[PDB]
Design a protein around this ligand. Structure first.
Ligand SMILES: [Mg+2]
Lengths: 250, 240, 235, 222, 231, 233, 244, 212
């Protein structure tokens, strides 16, 4: 046995292309549309719960994931790759930050750590790149609200609003017209639901849409009381009912 | 770990990786070594394709391994640093354990040994570098000049050149260097070294570097003007 | 591509067979064993007249009672010599005695096949190991990169080997003197060499029980070359 | 606390003649005040006309002799059935002993045979491998009782020629194998009388160019 | 063809070509012959020289006082496998005060050769061995192949032209097996057997190698003028 | 380095004209506490060897498993496992002796004293000792612990040297062993009345006797002993 | 076995070139142009972001200009992710040097170390090289203001003015034309932005498509100040020099 | 033990006693305390007998390898430092060694290095090591001159060991003399202390305290 693939499987071609990264980006392109929009007092990330079968319980499959109490993530591309990245991203937020500084990492640095993991899968021996593009929305005290995109290459870019996956080109054009630097979170959520409806074919409701926000602190979701400085998670996943309420005002 | 045998024999009995490493040396800028009666001179070509260069801080082509030995090269620049670093570490390790600085031959044998090791070790490629190692043994006034190459063979030379167009300057040296009477002075030795580079270099401006090494750790690099005076005198005698 | 330790359909290791081709390109080395000593002689083959030929070291001392001559990729021989010397000295340390020439040759040959995917390829050099011990007397061996060593009364390796070996076939007999062997090596070297043989482009050496292993001075060899010229002109 | 060492008593004696050597040793094996065995062979024929005894802690003694016999075997394999000379065996044993310099074989080793000129040879080792060729050496429990007797009766120490009164030493005339064996037996008889760990039986291995020969003698069993 | 790049690759007919190529090296090698009775076992080898100045490559190796083999193929590979046997024979003696059974020695060689045929990177051994011995169940003769197949036999032969000797032994089976308490006659049968595989060359004094082990006979090799008796 | 916990006392043995006898009581002591009364400390290996073990019982059980495993391993690919290539006492001993010395050399000994009693293929008696230090010796009589001090003197009166062995019969030898076991029961505070005895004869094979008891004991004289000097009543 | 799939990233071509290094350089030639210009009183780093969007959050974005320590900064051209791996190493090396000798790391020593790391990936390991070319801008008390560049081969060289990334041939010709030795920072700033403005593949050079920095002894008295320009400041200097 | 070595006009004198003890028990009177590292280098033995023997024979192997690789005699400095660097790796492990590495080369002339199991490596003109070192020092210091003859230097070294052999209980047996020249060491015999004492007493008039 032993992993005898100690050499790179991603290499520069004569034209200067890293083929495996390009192909990973093609896999991402096939993936279901997800998007992120940054408001003045919050961020919203959203995607379509593409159910593989009606017998499947799509609630058990979480496309939007909490990474830290103030940071959430969503993807487009290969689900399994996303799942393990979330596991690693959650752990690295503790090992390389919280266990050192006694606090959760700022969005940009957690993104930096995730990006590093994805870069290494692009150079390390005997592995292929991750076949996902992530959209990480988060908040921290000194940087405020932010929204990042992370690609299979490990490259990451901060966005005001964007979309990845299937209908990204059309969605990004839709977002460019609607976005401004004076949006409130509810306005962003409204635009998100509008943008996301364009890429969705079939049912469009709270059960077929996954949507979370980074907004105000939720002391009701903290689990305990007594410590004034601890005010609860800014990340919150919107319920099936909460989504449908806003779909009536759509 | 990566264990792949890159340097291997071909049906005709050649190690192509080692031979392709020599092709990298052929691409490198021309270097020349000439030993006089009481000195050795290392001449080196600087390609003038790169202007706007900062010549204060740009890695010089001749490197001191110790206060009495110098090393110039032709081939991959990044590769040469690894050999220079190893050689410098070994030079201090020799002083520490033997309580005496390295002989020029010993230092050459070490660098040649490193190069050889990289031609039959798994997972590594050969150094795309040939070196000229020159200097004087401790408490010795006899000039020393050696050459190494990617295969790991080394030998002593009365005068030698490596790199691009080295075939031409070797032609010049072979007819102009007399063994029975080598360049008696520093002047004569430097002059012959500059002359040999002028066969290949192009302009005698900032394209020629000269380093003179004398006995008892007396190493000095000539400046542009000092070299330019040799270039001037050579061509004025040539106009006849 | 293919394994480094792969067998060909004829039952030969590709790499070992290719290393033997590299050895055929090497400069000629010749050994001749007699009852007065073994003689080792090499072709230096300087690539240019500016190369100081005395720096060409293709004959090497392993111990006081064992000498060695090489042919092929001579850079590959350095680690083989280092091992040989270490083995000779180590055995003396462990047993307070000289090591047998065969045992030394065996220890060197054990390195040969330690290649795979240990080193990445076989050695590209062949050795003539010549020496003396109390048990078997004066001996000459031929160590190959296959790990096989043959004892020889006389042997030639390198580019002029098969022409030289055919000459050694005729000339060698069990009653050769050391002086006769010296002239014989010089004679055959001069035959197979491209350039004209002199004291600067050819080197002699010998191993005797009394004086041990000795590389010959250029002045000493020059006299043997002049002695050779006169005796060939003598008929 | 576990003590990895023990003392199995016993006494050995090597004497190098002019063209022969003897290595003798008692056959009693003990712990504390008890007798383990009245006949436990201590001196061994290791092949190549070499005899060996590692006296002291018997477990380390047996281990060393076993490893040396093995070394002799592998010396034949590796070096074309060449005979291991006594001096080469001695140097080899030094490396075996010094190999455990920091957890020593708790034994006083003696080997005996013939050198490469056919003369008698005895070598003597300390527990950590220091060694020397000697003409005479007793080892083990009663070594301190026997060595002075040998200095006097083998090397004629403190003996002078009558009439000269201290001016002329007694000349160092060579001893025959029958003479040496008498000194060996008297040494062990005397050692048996005054040392509690010595007794039961005496086994003498005699090395000549013809090979190894054994001789056994009864000792007092109290 | 496409399935002979390494040992780890079966062909479409279930063949291991690298192993078969290693098997080929043995056929190139010089002939050796093995045969036994109920008291003695005998190796007879034809040694091969490079030329007339060269020595004759040794073909027989001693493993223990009661065991040894003869080789055909890559000599270095025989050195490795004989060294391994020496160690296994030795371990058996040191640890268990027990002389290694010849059948168990065959099992150990089989397994060592097998590991080389199933793993990537390595190669099969390029040598065939004929092990003889005398243990607690009398005289024995094994035939090792680098495929791993070890076979206990009355008599056999490996190497170039070995088929001639092997047929002779197959005829003589009922005679040589009964040569008990007579080493010189058993060797004669072996020397006569190996003679069936000779062409052009004949058995000379530095050409012939013979070994023998038996009831009261340590494994002892006979070379040079020692075998002139049998020529 | 450890300390023995559950311990077994004397193992005694001797050679006689056709074979060997070995014996050991059935007690597993826990210091001064006589904890386990049904411990078998003689462990037969095949039909030609009996290993008697004293000292730490947990280590004895480990050794017992090693010997059980040794038999299994010897049978593998061995058509003569019950004939010419059966385990010999000399093989079993040398194996154990190797293990004991290796374990002491790692400063982690098997805290035992072992006597391997058996009969070899050629009919020769095998009797040899090995202990936690890897120390080995052989003798016409062998005994461990207290047996060394009390049994050996008695057994040596029967077989005082090698030449006495052919003169000694199995009945005389067994009588001496059984008498020795009684003496040890009188005088060893860590012994028991119940014991096992094994006879390995070259003719009749292995005879393993369980549930033997020390009998014909002398205690009647105790009634007359009064006080510690001057007391009369 | 595994050998079948091995690209063999660390081998010479028959011409004596390292395939992967050459292809990495080809990759880098498509990256946004970065320019360094050394003056007597400071250094200028100017770089072009690659086809950005209007929704990109520029003020929090960093893809070209990075800080190694207080004295040294780098301009990146190639794979950003690859560059960040090397940058974090360089930052650690500078801090190690500072901890050891209690002095800020001289610029060349840092550059050599990073360049040696790149070299290693071309000679051993079987991994692909870092598809990155750096421009190092820095200051120390030995050589003063220094400009270097390294590339995937691990070869580095010193410069008075240099460009990496796209259109370096055109850029270097323009720099070579207008550069002078007695030049000052404010003049270099103008040269850098003028060069980018001519070599750019974009229709017009604007603030949102640029990263800009200056290393100046324009810090109060004998000390050095790094200035990573903010979007608004890049917009001001573009107006000042007369490009927008 | 008593070993000494001193530099002078004619090279080096090395002189050693021969006794080896285990407590009060005289284990050997014929111990060779001068190792012949090679034909040009000498080493003395004090402290651990095995430690000195083993590692100075080993040193001879390292010195031999050096001159095989470098085609030149190893310097006394280099040879001594090989030994000192080795024992330094074993520092703390319990090696016991006090030795003079004595030699005579072209570049150095006659040179002596004191090498210690604590790692100490000292160059010097006169050294004295062992249980009887203090007694030998007394005779050496009061009689030493650079311009001693080879004959007088040899006697001084012999007499200095005799001084120590007499007084020091753990020194004695016999005196081994060496004289190191540039062409190699020259052995100057084994001298029994028992016979040497009475000889010196009479001829020199010394040891008037002792009755002879
Ligand atoms: Mg007694």
């Amino acid at each position: 046995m032993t992993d005898r693939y100690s050499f790179s499987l991603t290499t520069f071609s004569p034209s200067g292309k890293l083929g495996q990264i390009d192909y990973a980006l093609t896999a991402v392109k096939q993936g279901v549309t997800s998007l992120g929009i940054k408001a003045t007092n919050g961020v919203v990330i959203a995607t379509e719960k593409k159910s593989s079968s009606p017998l499947a319980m799509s609630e058990t499959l979480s496309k939007v994931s909490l990474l830290t109490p103030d940071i959430g993530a969503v993807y487009s591309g290969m689900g399994p790759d996303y799942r393990v990245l979330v596991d690693k991203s959650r752990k690295v937020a503790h090992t390389s930050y919280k266990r050192i500084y006694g606090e959760y990492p700022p969005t940009k640095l957690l993104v930096s750590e995730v990006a590093k993991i994805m870069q290494e899968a692009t150079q390390s021996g005997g592995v292929r790149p991750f076949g996902v593009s992530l959209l990480i929305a988060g908040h921290d005290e000194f940087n405020g609200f932010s929204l990042y995109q992370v690609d299979p290459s490990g490259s990451y870019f901060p966005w005001k609003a964007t979309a990845i996956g299937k209908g990204s080109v059309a969605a990004k054009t839709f977002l460019e017209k609607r976005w401004n630097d004076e949006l409130e979170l509810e306005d962003a959520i409204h635009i998100a639901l509008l943008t996301l409806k364009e890429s969705v074919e079939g049912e469009f409701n709270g059960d077929t849409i996954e949507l979370a926000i980074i907004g105000d602190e939720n002391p009701d979701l903290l689990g305990y009381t007594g410590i004034p400085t601890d005010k609860g998670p800014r990340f919150r996943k919107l319920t099936s009912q909460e989504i449908n309420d806003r779909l009536e005002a759509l | 770990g990566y264990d792949r045998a890159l340097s291997i024999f071909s049906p005709d009995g050649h190690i192509f990786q080692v031979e392709y490493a020599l092709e990298a040396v052929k691409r490198g800028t021309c270097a020349v070594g000439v030993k006089g009666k009481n000195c050795v001179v290392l001449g080196c070509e600087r390609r003038s394709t790169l202007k706007l260069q900062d010549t204060r801080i740009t890695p010089s082509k001749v490197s001191k391994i110790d206060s009495h030995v110098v090393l110039s090269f032709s081939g991959l620049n990044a590769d040469s640093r690894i050999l220079i670093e190893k050689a410098r570490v070994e030079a201090q390790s020799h002083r520490l354990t033997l309580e005496d600085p390295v002989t020029v031959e010993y230092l050459t044998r070490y660098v040649a040994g490193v190069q050889q090791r990289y031609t039959q070790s798994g997972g590594v490629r050969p150094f795309g570098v040939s070196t000229l190692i020159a200097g004087f043994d401790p408490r010795d006034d006899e000039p020393k000049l050696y050459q190494t190459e990617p295969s790991g063979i080394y030998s002593s030379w009365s005068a030698q050149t490596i790199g691009r167009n080295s075939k031409t300057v070797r032609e010049f040296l072979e007819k102009n260097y007399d063994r029975k009477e080598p360049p008696a002075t520093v002047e004569e030795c430097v002059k012959l070294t500059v002359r040999s580079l002028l066969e290949v270099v192009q302009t005698g401006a900032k394209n020629i570097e000269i380093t003179v090494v004398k006995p008892d750790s007396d190493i000095v690099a000539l400046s542009s003007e000092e070299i330019n005076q040799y270039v001037t005198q050579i061509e004025q005698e040539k106009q006849e | 591509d293919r394994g480094v330790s792969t067998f060909s359909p004829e039952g030969r290791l590709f790499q070992v067979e290719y290393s033997l081709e590299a050895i055929k390109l090497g400069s000629t080395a010749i050994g001749i064993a007699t009852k007065e000593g073994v003689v080792l002689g090499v072709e230096k083959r300087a690539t240019s007249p500016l190369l100081e030929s005395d720096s060409i070291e293709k004959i090497v001392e392993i111990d006081r009672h064992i000498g060695c001559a090489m042919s092929g990729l001579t850079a590959d021989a350095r680690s083989m010599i280092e091992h040989a010397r270490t083995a000779a000295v180590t055995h003396n340390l462990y047993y307070d005695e000289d090591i047998n020439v065969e045992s030394l040759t065996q220890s060197v040959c054990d390195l040969a096949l330690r290649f795979g995917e240990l080193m990445s390829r076989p050695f590209g050099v062949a050795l003539l190991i010549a020496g003396h011990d109390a048990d078997d007397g004066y001996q000459l061996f031929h160590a190959e990169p296959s790990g096989t060593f043959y004892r020889y009364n006389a042997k030639a390796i390198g580019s002029g080997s098969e022409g030289a070996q055919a000459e050694l076939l005729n000339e060698w007999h069990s009653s050769l003197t050391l002086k006769e062997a010296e002239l014989l090596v010089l004679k055959i070297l001069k035959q197979v060499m491209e350039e004209k043989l002199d004291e600067n482009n050819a080197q002699l050496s010998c191993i005797t029980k009394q004086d041990g292993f000795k590389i010959y001075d250029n002045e000493k060899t020059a006299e043997l070359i002049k002695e050779l010229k006169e005796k060939e002109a003598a008929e | 606390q576990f003590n990895p060492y023990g003392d199995n008593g016993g006494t050995i004696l090597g004497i190098a003649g002019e063209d022969f050597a003897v290595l003798a040793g008692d056959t009693r094996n003990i712990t504390d005040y008890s007798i383990n065995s009245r006949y436990e062979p201590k001196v061994f024929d290791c092949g190549d006309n070499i005899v060996m005894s590692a006296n002291g802690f018997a477990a380390d003694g047996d281990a060393l002799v076993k490893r040396f016999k093995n070394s002799v075997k592998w010396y034949h394999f590796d070096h074309n059935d060449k005979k291991l000379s006594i001096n080469s065996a001695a140097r080899n044993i030094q490396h075996l002993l010094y190999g455990k310099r920091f957890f020593p074989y708790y034994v006083h080793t003696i080997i005996a045979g013939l050198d490469e000129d056919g003369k008698g040879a005895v070598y003597s080792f300390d527990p950590v491998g220091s060694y020397e060729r000697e003409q005479c050496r007793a080892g083990g429990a009663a070594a301190s009782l026997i060595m002075p007797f040998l200095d006097n009766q083998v090397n004629f120490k403190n003996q002078y020629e009558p009439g000269t009164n201290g001016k002329v030493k007694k000349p160092l005339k060579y001893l025959s194998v029958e003479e040496v064996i008498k000194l060996v037996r008297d040494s062990f008889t005397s050692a048996t009388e005054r040392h509690i760990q010595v007794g039961d039986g005496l086994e003498i291995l005699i090395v000549t160019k013809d090979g190894v020969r054994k001789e056994f003698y009864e000792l007092k069993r109290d | 063809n496409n399935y002979d790049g390494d040992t780890v690759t079966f062909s479409p007919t279930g063949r291991l070509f690298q192993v078969e190529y290693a098997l080929e090296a043995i056929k190139q090698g010089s002939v050796t012959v093995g045969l036994r009775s109920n008291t003695h076992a005998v190796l007879v080898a034809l040694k091969r020289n490079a030329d007339e100045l060269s020595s004759y490559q040794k073909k027989i190796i001693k493993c223990d006082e009661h065991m040894g083999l003869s080789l055909a193929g890559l000599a270095p590979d025989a050195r490795v496998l004989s060294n391994y046997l020496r160690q296994q024979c030795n371990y058996s003696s040191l640890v268990f005060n027990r002389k290694l059974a010849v059948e168990r020695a065959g099992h150990l060689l089989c397994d060592k050769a097998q590991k080389n045929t199933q793993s990537y990177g390595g190669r099969p051994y390029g040598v065939g061995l004929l092990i003889i011995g005398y243990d607690k169940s009398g005289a024995h003769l094994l035939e090792f192949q680098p495929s791993g197949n070890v076979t206990e036999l009355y008599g056999t032969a490996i190497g170039a032209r070995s088929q001639g000797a092997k047929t002779y032994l197959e005829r003589t089976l009922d005679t040589f097996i009964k040569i008990d308490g007579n080493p010189d006659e058993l060797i004669k049968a072996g020397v006569e057997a190996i003679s069936q595989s000779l062409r052009d060359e004949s058995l000379t004094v530095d050409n012939l190698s013979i070994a023998i082990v038996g009831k009261d006979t340590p494994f002892t090799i006979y070379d040079g003028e020692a075998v002139a008796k049998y020529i | 380095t450890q300390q023995p916990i559950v311990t077994g006392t004397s193992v005694i043995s001797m050679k006689y004209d056709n074979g060997v006898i070995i014996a050991a009581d059935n007690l597993g002591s826990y210091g001064s506490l006589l904890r386990f009364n049904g411990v078998e400390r003689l462990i037969p290996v095949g039909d030609n060897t009996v290993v008697g073990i004293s000292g730490d019982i947990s280590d004895m059980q480990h050794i017992e498993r090693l010997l059980k495993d040794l038999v299994t391993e010897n049978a593998y690919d061995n058509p003569l496992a019950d004939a010419e290539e059966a385990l010999e006492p000399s093989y079993i001993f040398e194996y154990l002796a190797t293990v004991m010395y290796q374990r002491r050399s790692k400063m982690n000994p098997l805290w035992n004293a072992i006597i391997v009693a058996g009969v070899q293929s050629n009919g020769d008696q095998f009797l040899r000792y090995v202990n936690l230090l890897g120390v080995t010796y052989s003798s016409p009589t062998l005994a461990t612990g207290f047996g060394a001090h009390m049994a050996n003197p008695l057994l040596r009166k029967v077989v005082d040297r090698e030449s006495d062995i052919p003169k000694t019969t199995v009945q005389v030898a067994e009588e001496a062993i059984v008498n020795a076991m009684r003496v040890l029961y009188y005088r060893d505070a860590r012994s028991s009345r119940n014991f096992s005895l094994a006879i390995i004869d070259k003719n009749t094979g292995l005879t393993f006797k369980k549930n033997l008891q020390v009998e014909n004991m002398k205690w009647d004289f105790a009634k007359d002993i009064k006080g510690y000097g001057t007391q009369k009543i | 076995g595994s050998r079948r799939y091995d690209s063999r990233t660390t081998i010479f071509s028959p011409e004596g070139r390292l395939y992967q290094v050459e292809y990495a350089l080809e990759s880098i030639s498509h990256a946004g142009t970065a320019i360094g210009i050394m003056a007597s009183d400071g250094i200028v780093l100017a770089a072009e972001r690659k086809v950005t969007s209007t929704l990109l959050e520029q003020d929090t974005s960093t893809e070209k200009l990075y800080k190694l320590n207080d004295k040294i900064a780098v301009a990146v051209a190639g794979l950003t992710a690859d560059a960040e791996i090397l940058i974090n190493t360089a930052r650690i090396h500078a801090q190690n040097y500072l901890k050891t000798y209690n002095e800020d790391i001289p610029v060349e020593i840092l550059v050599r170390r990073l360049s040696d790391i790149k070299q290693g990936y071309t000679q051993h390991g079987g991994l692909r090289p870092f598809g990155v070319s750096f421009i190092y801008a820095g200051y120390d008390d030995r050589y003063g203001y220094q400009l270097y560049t390294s590339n995937p081969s691990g070869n580095y060289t010193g410069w008075k003015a240099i460009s990496v990334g796209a259109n370096t041939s055109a850029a270097q010709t323009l720099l070579q034309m207008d550069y002078k030795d007695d030049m000052k920072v404010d003049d270099a700033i103008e040269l850098a932005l003028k060069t980018l403005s001519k070599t750019t593949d974009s229709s017009a050079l604007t603030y949102d498509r640029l990263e800009f920095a200056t290393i100046r002894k324009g810090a109060n008295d004998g000390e050095v100040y790094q200035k990573i320009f903010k979007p608004q400041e890049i917009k001001d200097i573009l107006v000042k020099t007369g490009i927008t | 033990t008593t070993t000494l070595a001193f530099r002078f006009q004619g090279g080096i004198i090395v002189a050693v006693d021969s006794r080896a003890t285990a407590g009060n028990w005289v284990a050997s009177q014929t111990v060779k305390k001068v190792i012949e590292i090679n034909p040009f280098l000498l080493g003395t033995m004090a402290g651990g007998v095995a430690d000195c023997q083993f590692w100075e024979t080993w040193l001879g192997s390292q010195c031999r390898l050096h001159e095989l690789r470098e085609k030149e005699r190893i310097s006394v400095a280099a040879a001594s430092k090989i030994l000192s660097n080795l024992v330094y790796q074993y520092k703390g492990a319990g090696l016991s060694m006090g030795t003079m590495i004595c030699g005579y080369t072209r570049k150095e002339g006659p040179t002596i290095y004191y090498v210690d199991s604590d790692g100490t490596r000292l160059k010097g003109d006169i050294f004295c090591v062992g249980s009887g070192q203090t007694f030998a020092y007394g005779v050496l210091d009061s009689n030493y001159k650079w311009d001693l003859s080879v004959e007088d230097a040899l006697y001084l070294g012999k007499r200095s060991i005799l001084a120590a052999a007499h007084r020091d209980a753990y020194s004695g047996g016999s005196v081994n003399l060496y004289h190191v020249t540039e062409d190699g060491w020259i052995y100057h015999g084994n001298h029994d202390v028992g016979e040497l004492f009475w000889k010196v007493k009479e001829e020199e008039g010394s040891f008037n305290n002792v009755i002879g």
